[PDB]
Amino acid sequence: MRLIPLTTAEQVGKWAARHIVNRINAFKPTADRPFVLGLPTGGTPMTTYKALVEMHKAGQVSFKHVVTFNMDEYVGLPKEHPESYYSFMHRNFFDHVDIPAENINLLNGNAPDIDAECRQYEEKIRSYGKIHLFMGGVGNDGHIAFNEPASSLASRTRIKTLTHDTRVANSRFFDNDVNQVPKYALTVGVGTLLDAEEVMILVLGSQKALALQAAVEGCVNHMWTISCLQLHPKAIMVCDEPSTMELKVKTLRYFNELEAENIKGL
Amino acid sequence: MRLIPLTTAEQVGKWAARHIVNRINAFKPTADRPFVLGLPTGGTPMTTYKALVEMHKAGQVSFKHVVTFNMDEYVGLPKEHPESYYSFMHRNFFDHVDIPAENINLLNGNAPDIDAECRQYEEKIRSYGKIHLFMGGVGNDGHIAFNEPASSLASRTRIKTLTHDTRVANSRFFDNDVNQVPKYALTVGVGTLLDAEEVMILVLGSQKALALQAAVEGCVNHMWTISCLQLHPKAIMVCDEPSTMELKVKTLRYFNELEAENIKGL
Amino acid sequence: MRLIPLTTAEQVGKWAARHIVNRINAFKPTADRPFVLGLPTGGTPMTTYKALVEMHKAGQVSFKHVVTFNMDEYVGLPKEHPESYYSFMHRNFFDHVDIPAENINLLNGNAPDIDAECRQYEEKIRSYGKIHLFMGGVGNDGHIAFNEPASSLASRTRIKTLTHDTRVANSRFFDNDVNQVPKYALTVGVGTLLDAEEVMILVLGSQKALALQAAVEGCVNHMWTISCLQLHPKAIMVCDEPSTMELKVKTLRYFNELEAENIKGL
Amino acid sequence: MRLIPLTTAEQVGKWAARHIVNRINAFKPTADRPFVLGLPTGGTPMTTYKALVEMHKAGQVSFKHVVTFNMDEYVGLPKEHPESYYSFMHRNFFDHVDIPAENINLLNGNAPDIDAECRQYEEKIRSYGKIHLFMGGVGNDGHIAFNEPASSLASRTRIKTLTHDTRVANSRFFDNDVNQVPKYALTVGVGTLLDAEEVMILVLGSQKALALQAAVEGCVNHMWTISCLQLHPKAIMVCDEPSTMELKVKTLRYFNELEAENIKGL
Amino acid sequence: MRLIPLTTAEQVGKWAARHIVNRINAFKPTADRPFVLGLPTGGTPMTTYKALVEMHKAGQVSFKHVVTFNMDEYVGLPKEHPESYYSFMHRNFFDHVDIPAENINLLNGNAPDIDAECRQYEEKIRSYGKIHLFMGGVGNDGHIAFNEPASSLASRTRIKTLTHDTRVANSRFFDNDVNQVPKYALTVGVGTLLDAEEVMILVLGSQKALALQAAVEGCVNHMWTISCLQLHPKAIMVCDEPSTMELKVKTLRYFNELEAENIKGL
Amino acid sequence: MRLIPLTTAEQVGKWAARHIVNRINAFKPTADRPFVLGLPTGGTPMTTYKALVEMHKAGQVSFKHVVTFNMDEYVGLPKEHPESYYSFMHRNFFDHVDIPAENINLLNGNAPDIDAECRQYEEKIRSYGKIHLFMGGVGNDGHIAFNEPASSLASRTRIKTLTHDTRVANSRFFDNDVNQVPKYALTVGVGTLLDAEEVMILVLGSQKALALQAAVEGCVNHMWTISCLQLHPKAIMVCDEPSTMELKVKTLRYFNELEAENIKGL
Ligand SMILES: O=C(CO)[C@@H](O)[C@H](O)[C@H](O)COP(=O)(O)O
Ligand SMILES: O=C(CO)[C@@H](O)[C@H](O)[C@H](O)COP(=O)(O)O
Ligand SMILES: O=C(CO)[C@@H](O)[C@H](O)[C@H](O)COP(=O)(O)O
Ligand SMILES: O=C(CO)[C@H](O)[C@H](O)[C@H](O)COP(=O)(O)O
Ligand SMILES: O=C(CO)[C@H](O)[C@H](O)[C@H](O)COP(=O)(O)O
Ligand SMILES: O=C(CO)[C@H](O)[C@H](O)[C@H](O)COP(=O)(O)O
Ligand SMILES: O=C(CO)[C@H](O)[C@H](O)[C@H](O)COP(=O)(O)O
Ligand SMILES: O=C(CO)[C@H](O)[C@H](O)[C@H](O)COP(=O)(O)O
Ligand SMILES: O=C(CO)[C@H](O)[C@H](O)[C@H](O)COP(=O)(O)O
Ligand SMILES: O=C(CO)[C@H](O)[C@H](O)[C@H](O)COP(=O)(O)O
Ligand SMILES: O=C(CO)[C@H](O)[C@H](O)[C@H](O)COP(=O)(O)O
Ligand SMILES: O=C(CO)[C@H](O)[C@H](O)[C@H](O)COP(=O)(O)O
């Protein structure tokens, strides 16, 4: 695994955005061979979406031949609701770039048949072949997507019951009232994520320090699903300073030595 | 993983039996497409075999098109011995249901060529395709089938030397004399079990509390092979009250919330 | 996993050599079906190379139809340098046995295109099909080959930055001057090793006691990559006495009972 | 120790307030033999202070012969600043009860000789003999008073540097401006607390879940100073529901049956 | 501490009995200066009591000037009930030796003022000065005496509520009827034990393997009160083979070489 | 405790030497009130002893009124043997300073009554009252003095059997011949050390990284006796860079900001 030890959220966003751009440009996507990008919501990717939109407007990237898939979506939350993941993605990213509406893939949290909806999302990924880069964040409790504690490490897209801890954390977006946070969500599985060619996790704040420790220095287990990355051949964690506080000095020293040139570019 | 927190062994048996019945009936097995059931011995499945036989006699299930495979068998123990797994299964299940003798698969602990016997058991599973539901229990030391501490997590059917701890526990069936308990057994591997479509483990008593903790809150490791379930896409653990004593309050709370409707049916 | 608890390095070498000979002879390699052997360097395999050369000269083994692959090699170290792994292997093994030069495979640490070199080494393994037996050792920090702490458990052959701890340990071969130890090395991946049919690790000295504990009694994790063996269907660890000091009494007792006949042959 | 498992912060303050009043009335303090009460600040004791005030108003307790000592005080913060502990205590407690000004002992965070201040505080306690009851809270990092991680378990009153985490936690009272929270604070030591006849710690909120687990199920260490309570002859922890989430099922079960009739008072 | 690694419970009782007799004879007790012996009940000390009796019969020891204090006694159980500790001690020890009735101190589990009973017991010990040797056993959950998990490490003699596990364990003596085992018991505290000049704990059986590991290799904590022995100046643990199974190899090796000539007596 | 994070062993000896001189000068010892210094041997204090010598030479300190006590001494090793602690201390320290022979207290490793020797040493310390400063090092296994793992935390000066690991470590001074290193040694106990007014431990090298982690972030236990420092009112650990590699990032950060201006002296 690669861990990029940066200082601030602004730097994290800039490194991630730049990595996404270079992968796409190096890929040279065509209409017959698009680049498939998996994306997350939440507060963590804000600086990355910001940087991505800038680079696009500056003419550095084109999303014309990029197909996107999101990690999850709230169940039973009106699609028009500003806090639905559909609204989040359009407001913060889609409405600003040249990506065709047919290239966008989002789960329908209001689908009448939940099993069918999840299964079809898997079929859609399969029709493209693979997700080339899946970007995400991590929960306080260590979840990747919404694969809460005790989620199978070989899981597929399906519905999951959100942990009280996750709902309290997400209530910050629902006027700080947990009763307004949806109780369920459709989410890609750990197995789904393990199938992506590259996984890039963004980690910000001391609130994520225990999750980062579990991922990097902990053992593989289903309580902290972020530990599944130890089993992925190409995972990267991009971190700010506060989030690395629980790591051993030797561990952080190793990554600093490794990524010195790859980050110190002002 | 799913964990069903029940109170007594009677409830555990009833939930498990009911789950087996609904899977079979939903499957609609034919002579050209049978339902393959993996089964265990020991004290744990007693209430489940009892409930299964009842439901059969009440006309709720038919084992006519069900093929069964057992987890293991003692090596060097006469097949006629009442404590052999062959005798256990006939006395407690086979002799009471409408399953054809040709649909029953048991390992021969007295086979002259042990490697050949184990290999052929694997071939037989393969000829059917897959085990749809493999039911089992857990050892005090955390073993699944007889995959004792330090058993490969990718293991196949083979012979294994029983741990002194396992023999002392099993001596309860041999007049409380460990010297009468067989030292070896042929057992399906962890990889064999991981290949089943669904795995259902029954957990009863405080004697199993540490094993349950390891499975649910511990990391993946070969010392407590029951932890392999964290890697299975469809595992369920059915527990009574005493067995959950080593779990964290938050963990048990999560499962109770999840399975409330799925268990509270009187 | 199998653990062979021996007393001295001389016994370890003799058991390992004998195991390699019996595998080859049982295989009956031909020019159209060679035996593929993966090999390590370092101080650990010294007694095994010694015993192998003896058995060859005594007419017990022939390496005529054996193809070999080494685990790694230093990057930027002149091939002629006595401490390069190319020199180590020729001096200690190749120059003494009847193995054809075309059957030898070593990584080129001075290759102009590192990615290409690593990729081609993988292709070469693939053209043979599989490595039948991969022999190795373990690092103080728990590494297998040079898959240092935080290496993916599904990794392939690639370049890796050596840990300060590994360089200090290896400086014993460079006049005890860490500044002379290369900083990088091309190494087979954990996934590469997991693909071998059988893996045999040699463990010598109390300096390796924590690594052995992690492998046998620890959980699967990428910090101690030797733990990947818990996931291999056919792994063996051959140990001397000092290296088992960190194991539990019950664990060592189990293996002693198991391997009693398999080792007590004077 | 005794752990009182309650549901709400309202029940916690009421249970703690009733306990203090019961101790005081049983002691029957007088001018020559006052009851010595140790007290804390922060958000946790609010409901306790309100309840004590209601009880004093109803005529149930008098503080005429109660001498108090506070745990700590910020260094360099002006005395009349609303966030100084001096201000907090008068506003939330002293202003509403009949306690004589001479009976109130607070640390002078702005004294010329900080070292003389600490020595004199310890002297003051000794002049009275012993603190009969010391009430306190617990930090997210497990500190008792401001004895931050790595504080001697035999420490006395002295100056202490606040951990970055505590300042972030306390910033709530400084307009979430960490820069405004004082970096230093005079505090009573762990030995000072262990010298008290009885220690009662109030635990509220999920954020204290790990600190509660460290105090109850962890080992004694100087990283989580709250663990010192395992060494005290008479320690009580009064908790609400969310703070108990990281404890084992059997732990909370034990305490629930012990305190059943002891908390039924509503 | 000293750990005496023996094989059998017969050797354990003989080693412990010889130790007591040696201490007593060396002390040379008299009416004005008696030897004070602290004693336990339960299944563990049986072989010790038998051996002590054989030694007294052979003329090797006299209890004429030995004062005894027992660790605990069940609350509410009638005195002449065969399972009361009073009954156990007379039947298994007092009835066969020359100890004066006035030298025997037992806890009155059926006293009117339970609190007065405990205070007076502590007073009795103080009147003699100090207990010279306190013998005890260890519970499966690590309790010393009946100082159940979460008992203060500075505790004194008091009333205590038995853990569900201890009652299950003790049900062996109550026809395996847990409902018959007393729920409460008066017991000496951890501080009471730490005040003794020397403490000797007998450990027998695999069931105590984890308690032994907690006492020897664990950290001091109030969950496994047996860990208090790390703080005692003169603590001895006498063990049989199965109780040592959870210790590390190097731990048991150290103790074996230290006590070699000290246990060769047969 | 205080942890002084320095880079080099040269800075460590200089910081420790300046600390001793400052304590001595502030104390202003005299014939009737000498300063009592506890001292160690081994490789760690070399730079400290050199620095103290340079300071005495420059006229900064006098040892005319300093009484010293050493931690331990090998049993059975001839006094004038260059590796005896008596020889080490005179050669490395006493020969170069103005300390009177009568002020020097060393353990007599070759005394007729070893037990009388230990009792008299403790008596000697008591006659002076208290050791004001005890300097020591830490073993790889965490021992303080020669209080090997499983040593009472309340122990006094006594004879002790060296662990195999310590003898291997100390063989460096005996031509790497473990057989030449004395198996026994008289040593001060943990209680003896805890009775000192201040304890300063010097930590140098990666080999002590785990011992440092056990002392700072671990729990108090008798396996790593260095952990006793968590219980001491005034303990200081002076470390070089490599010994800090196993600590968490936040731990070392806390200490760095606390001691910033306290180590800038060069
Ligand atoms: O010294 C004190 C209080 O005088 C602290 O230990 C607090 O008790 C603890 O930091 C909790 O703070 P709150 O969460 O209650 O605000
Ligand atoms: O208070 C006592 C004994 O008076 C207990 O700590 C027992 O020593 C322990 O429960 C062992 O019981 P047995 O296993 O020996 O019966
Ligand atoms: O009793 C002593 C010293 O008198 C020991 O605890 C050493 O301080 C420790 O073994 C370190 O040894 P070195 O690594 O410094 O040689
Ligand atoms: O699937 C989701 C996001 O759609 C994730 O697991 C979040 O990345 C994680 O919960 C963090 O959320 P933030 O802290 O970024 O808000
Ligand atoms: O839809 C999900 C089913 O997969 C459920 O409500 C179950 O609780 C599930 O079995 C647990 O999750 P995983 O093991 O699938 O993560
Ligand atoms: O393979 C076997 C059973 O054939 C198992 O691992 C048992 O389920 C386990 O050993 C528990 O046994 P009981 O406690 O149910 O008897
Ligand atoms: O037949 C089994 C062989 O697999 C053996 O006696 C070995 O001891 C085995 O190698 C260990 O078990 P696994 O790693 O296969 O579980
Ligand atoms: O890849 C390598 C060797 O080419 C290994 O991981 C070594 O086996 C290990 O580093 C031990 O080295 P020695 O202790 O045997 O020297
Ligand atoms: O060539 C290796 C790349 O694989 C690198 O320098 C990276 O640091 C790597 O991503 C880490 O290692 P693995 O996770 O691949 O072990
Ligand atoms: O005034 C306190 C000193 O007692 C200091 O700033 C030190 O940092 C102290 O040595 C650490 O704290 P304790 O070990 O005393 O908790
Ligand atoms: O009589 C005992 C009281 O000392 C009680 O029932 C309490 O439960 C006690 O506070 C807990 O035990 P210790 O902390 O005193 O062990
Ligand atoms: O002279 C010492 C005795 O105090 C001994 O050889 C013992 O082994 C001792 O009981 C253990 O050491 P401590 O528990 O006293 O450290």
Side-chain angles (χ1 to χ4, degrees), chain A residues 36-192:
Chain A
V36 189
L37 226 202
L39 297 168
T41 54
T44 305
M46 292 303 276
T47 58
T48 304
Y49 280 133
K50 240 74 168 64
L52 275 176
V53 178
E54 281 177 5
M55 296 174 89
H56 171 245
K57 288 193 298 199
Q60 278 124 73
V61 220
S62 175
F63 295 92
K64 171 58 173 184
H65 293 112
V66 160
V67 173
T68 66
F69 284 90
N70 268 70
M71 285 190 321
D72 39 53
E73 174 64 281
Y74 283 119
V75 166
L77 208 260
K79 190 219 304 300
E80 336 311 315
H81 191 289
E83 293 302 328
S84 73
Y85 292 163
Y86 169 96
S87 301
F88 177 99
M89 291 301 301
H90 276 98
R91 179 176 63 238
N92 297 302
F93 185 56
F94 300 151
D95 292 348
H96 313 303
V97 293
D98 64 334
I99 186 175
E102 58 254 35
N103 283 17
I104 298 170
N105 295 277
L106 298 169
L107 282 149
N108 183 359
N110 297 304
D113 187 340
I114 281 158
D115 287 354
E117 170 67 19
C118 291
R119 175 184 145 147
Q120 296 160 353
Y121 202 64
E122 284 277 343
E123 286 172 7
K124 233 296 176 78
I125 294 179
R126 146 88 191 165
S127 72
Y128 282 105
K130 56 181 285 180
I131 290 170
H132 308 287
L133 175 52
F134 213 133
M135 180 179 89
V138 64
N140 291 356
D141 63 7
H143 68 228
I144 184 172
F146 280 138
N147 292 286
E148 299 280 38
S151 280
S152 169
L153 296 180
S155 54
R156 290 284 141 184
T157 303
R158 65 209 184 298
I159 176 169
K160 292 290 294 196
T161 298
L162 297 188
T163 248
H164 184 249
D165 319 85
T166 289
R167 299 215 301 133
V168 165
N170 283 7
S171 70
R172 105 183 78 123
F173 299 123
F174 293 84
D175 295 301
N176 295 115
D177 176 11
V178 172
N179 308 348
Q180 294 301 275
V181 176
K183 292 184 181 183
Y184 316 99
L186 264 30
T187 183
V188 287
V190 175
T192 311

Side-chain angles (χ1 to χ4, degrees), chain D residues 1 216 220 230-232 254 258, chain E residues 150 152-154 161 220-222:
Chain D
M1 69 168 46
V216 186
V220 348
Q230 301 187 17
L231 299 175
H232 200 281
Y254 182 74
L258 280 200
Chain E
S152 174
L153 294 174
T161 299
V220 348
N221 69 92
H222 70 173

Side-chain angles (χ1 to χ4, degrees), chain F residues 197-239:
Chain F
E197 201 190 330
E198 176 179 45
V199 182
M200 176 180 265
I201 303 297
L202 277 21
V203 192
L204 297 179
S206 62
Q207 271 259 240
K208 305 295 178 59
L210 292 176
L212 211 229
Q213 175 194 45
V216 186
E217 297 177 4
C219 293
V220 348
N221 69 92
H222 70 173
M223 286 300 273
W224 301 77
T225 57
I226 184 70
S227 73
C228 72
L229 297 185
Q230 301 187 17
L231 299 175
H232 200 281
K234 241 182 183 293
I236 309 184
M237 302 216 266
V238 190
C239 316

Side-chain angles (χ1 to χ4, degrees), chain B residues 148-155 160-165 219-223 231, chain C residues 1-2 215-220 229-234 250-251 254-255 257-258:
Chain B
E148 299 280 38
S151 280
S152 169
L153 296 180
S155 54
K160 292 290 294 196
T161 298
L162 297 188
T163 248
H164 184 249
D165 319 85
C219 286
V220 171
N221 69 87
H222 70 170
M223 288 290 116
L231 303 171
Chain C
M1 160 199 279
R2 275 179 77 191
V216 182
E217 290 178 6
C219 286
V220 171
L229 297 197
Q230 298 188 16
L231 303 171
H232 193 280
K234 193 180 298 174
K250 69 193 301 206
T251 307
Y254 184 73
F255 296 123
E257 296 190 46
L258 238 70

